Amino acid sequence: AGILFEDIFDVKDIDPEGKKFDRVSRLHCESESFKMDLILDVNIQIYPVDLGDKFRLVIASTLYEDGTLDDGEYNPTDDRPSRADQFEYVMYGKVYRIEGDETSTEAATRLSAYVSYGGLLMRLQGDANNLHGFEVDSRVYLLMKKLA
Amino acid sequence: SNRPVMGIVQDTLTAVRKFTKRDVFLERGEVMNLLMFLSTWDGKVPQPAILKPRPLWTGKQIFSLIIPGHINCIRTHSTHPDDEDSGPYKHISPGDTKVVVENGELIMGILCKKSLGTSAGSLVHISYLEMGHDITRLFYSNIQ
Amino acid sequence: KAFEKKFRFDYTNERALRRTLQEDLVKDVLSNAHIQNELEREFERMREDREVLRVIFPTGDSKVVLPCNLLRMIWNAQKIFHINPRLPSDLHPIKVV
Amino acid sequence: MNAPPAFESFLLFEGEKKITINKDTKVPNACLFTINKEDHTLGNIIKSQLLKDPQVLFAGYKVPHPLEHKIIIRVQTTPDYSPQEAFTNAITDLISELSLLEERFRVAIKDKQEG
């Protein structure tokens, strides 16, 4: 398995701060199941995105579906049984910050995860119950597909 | 003045900034060329930031291979506003305008004179202090 | 107020201790009084150093030139040893002092 | 007074081997090709042809110094295939493409001239 997160998101804004980069825009997405808030930077030319679009977002530790570490190297020739390639848009990055709602006295109810995909950043806020699978300085794959 | 004397100057600094912006996506052959011009490269091609539509690398992703050892540094770009630190988006800067290097890897930010130049606490100064003179030489040459 | 809150090591709450320090070590910290005496002596030394600093640096300029960068060094250690801030620590507060 | 003669761009002297092959110890199945007295004309061609081979993992070239006339080519291939074989196959494919291009260019010239 190795799937840390999975949900369906609705695109609410594209550039609220204005378009600061030509090929990159910042999706603000709400979530229809868990009410997880999402901020994501997406390459526009490679994968256009418009307002009011349903896409399924999956965050996984490995692409191989079997529980085998990917070792973090590029090898396009490796025909392992699946590359979890059922998704249109795939990114690779690392978690660099996990903020929380904790005080000194009691534990966090809402967490936020900060992932950088080679310069493209994502923030994912919501309840800590389903967001516990993330650990800082760990490798994370992003998986996206549009829905009808 | 306990500062580095040598810095990145002329074409190379402007190219550093334009290369380290977010919009820079590098194709496979371009990546192989840039890695061919690395002297300290270990010979392993990093996994691209973008995989499926096409394999696309990023400028920060290749700059992280230039950065030697495991260097921890935090600077700010010249165009950094003071509004971002107050409200939200503190750690997800919308203009790309804060610099974070963790474990010898550029996570976010646009480099400029305030990061690669001759100033106290610069990336080159921290590299010298952590790694010594022999590795900082290769760091200048590889950047160039 | 902020200086005391940040540097006093309050050990009365126990619940912040249970969150920050390990289960095996919080009992040792709470039962022994020699530990508490040493930890109060540390804060007394820190108050004295604060008074010395306020004598040395009027106008309150906190920028000082010193040999080795302790914040960068602590940050290097955190990344070298894969330290998780979300988990309780096993470092005994006596050994720090 | 220090000007090199016009021919170091194009001509070998006693002792220079046109090609020198050195294995790369950093990565398995990696080799380093040194071509003397050549320039971008040939390096870009060979690199572009090598990048089409599905069994080639890395392919790049560079001129170490423009004032010197020397090409270095690095080829890394998958485990069951030699970068030497990749280089020979690339050269043969380039020659085969060029011969066909020459023949079709001659046919086009003849069709253009007699209407």
UniProtKB/Swiss-Prot annotation, chain A:
> What keyword terms does UniProt attach to this protein?
Acetylation, DNA-binding, DNA-directed RNA polymerase, Nucleus, Transcription
Residue ranges for the region (Non-specific ssDNA binding) are: 15-39
Q: Cellular location of this protein? A: Nucleus; Nucleus, Nucleolus
Per the record, the major location class is nucleus
One GO cellular component term noted in the UniProt record for this chain: cytosol
Q: Give the multimer and partner information.
A: Component of the RNA polymerase I (Pol I), RNA polymerase II (Pol II) and RNA polymerase III (Pol III) complexes consisting of at least 13, 12 and 17 subunits, respectively. Pol I complex consists of a ten-subunit catalytic core composed of POLR1A/RPA1, POLR1B/RPA2, POLR1C/RPAC1, POLR1D/RPAC2, POLR1H/RPA12, POLR2E/RPABC1, POLR2F/RPABC2, POLR2H/RPABC3, POLR2K/RPABC4 and POLR2L/RPABC5; a mobile stalk subunit POLR1F/RPA43 protruding from the core and additional subunits homologous to general transcription factors POLR1E/RPA49 and POLR1G/RPA34.
Assigned protein family: Belongs to the eukaryotic RPB8 RNA polymerase subunit family.
Protein known as: DNA-directed RNA polymerases I, II, and III subunit RPABC3
Swiss-Prot record, chain C:
- PTM per Swiss-Prot/TrEMBL: The tandem heptapeptide repeats in the C-terminal domain (CTD) can be highly phosphorylated. The phosphorylation activates Pol II. Phosphorylation occurs mainly at residues 'Ser-2' and 'Ser-5' of the heptapeptide repeat and is mediated, at least, by CDK7 and CDK9. POLR2A associated with DNA is specifically phosphorylated at 'Ser-5' of the CTD by CDK7, promoting transcription initiation by triggering dissociation from DNA. Phosphorylated at 'Ser-2', Ser-5' and 'Ser-7' of the CTD by CDK9 (P-TEFb complex), promoting transcription elongation. Among tandem heptapeptide repeats of the C-terminal domain (CTD) some do not match the Y-S-P-T-S-P-S consensus, the seventh serine residue 'Ser-7' being replaced by a lysine. 'Lys-7' in these non-consensus heptapeptide repeats can be alternatively acetylated, methylated and dimethylated. EP300 is one of the enzyme able to acetylate 'Lys-7'. Acetylation at 'Lys-7' of non-consensus heptapeptide repeats is associated with 'Ser-2' phosphorylation and active transcription. Regulates initiation or early elongation steps of transcription specially for inducible genes.
Q: What is known of its domains?
A: The C-terminal domain (CTD) serves as a platform for assembly of factors that regulate transcription initiation, elongation, termination and mRNA processing. The trigger loop allows entry of NTPs into the active site, switching between an open and closed state with each NTP addition cycle.
The family note in this entry says: Belongs to the RNA polymerase beta' chain family.
Species for this entry: Homo sapiens
The name of this protein is DNA-directed RNA polymerase II subunit RPB1
> What superkingdom does the record give?
Eukaryota
Q: Where does this polypeptide localize? A: Nucleus; Cytoplasm; Chromosome
* Ranges annotated as spanning the membrane: none
From Swiss-Prot, chain D:
Q: Which source organism?
A: Homo sapiens (Human)
An example of a Pfam family matching this protein is RNA_pol_L_2
UniProt GO MF annotations: DNA binding; DNA-directed RNA polymerase activity; LRR domain binding; protein dimerization activity
Q: What does the function comment of this entry state?
A: Core component of RNA polymerase II (Pol II), a DNA-dependent RNA polymerase which synthesizes mRNA precursors and many functional non-coding RNAs using the four ribonucleoside triphosphates as substrates.
The gene it comes from is POLR2J
The protein's matches in SUPFAM superfamilies, at most eight in alphabetical order, are given as: RBP11-like subunits of RNA polymerase (SSF55257)
Instruction: Kindly provide the name given to this protein in its UniProt entry.
Output: DNA-directed RNA polymerase II subunit RPB11-a
Q: Which HAMAP family match?
A: RNApol_arch_Rpo11
Main localization is nucleus
Give the record's family classification: Belongs to the archaeal Rpo11/eukaryotic RPB11/RPC19 RNA polymerase subunit family.
**Tissue specificity:** Ubiquitously expressed. High expression was found in heart and skeletal muscle.
Q: List GO BP terms, alphabetically.
A: transcription by RNA polymerase II
* GO cellular component terms, semicolon-separated: nucleoplasm; nucleus; RNA polymerase II, core complex
Summarize subunit and interaction data from the UniProt record for this chain.
Component of the RNA polymerase II (Pol II) core complex consisting of 12 subunits: a ten-subunit catalytic core composed of POLR2A/RPB1, POLR2B/RPB2, POLR2C/RPB3, POLR2I/RPB9, POLR2J/RPB11, POLR2E/RPABC1, POLR2F/RPABC2, POLR2H/RPABC3, POLR2K/RPABC4 and POLR2L/RPABC5 and a mobile stalk composed of two subunits POLR2D/RPB4 and POLR2G/RPB7, protruding from the core and functioning primarily in transcription initiation. Part of Pol II(G) complex, in which Pol II core associates with an additional subunit POLR2M; unlike conventional Pol II, Pol II(G) functions as a transcriptional repressor.
The record, for InterPro entries, names: RBP11, RBP11-like, RBP11-like_dimer, RNA_pol_Rpb11_13-16kDa_CS, Rpo11-like
Sorted UniProt keywords = Acetylation, DNA-directed RNA polymerase, Nucleus, Transcription
Q: Which CDD domains match?
A: RNAP_II_RPB11
Compartments, record wording: Nucleus
Sites where N-acetylmethionine occurs are at M1
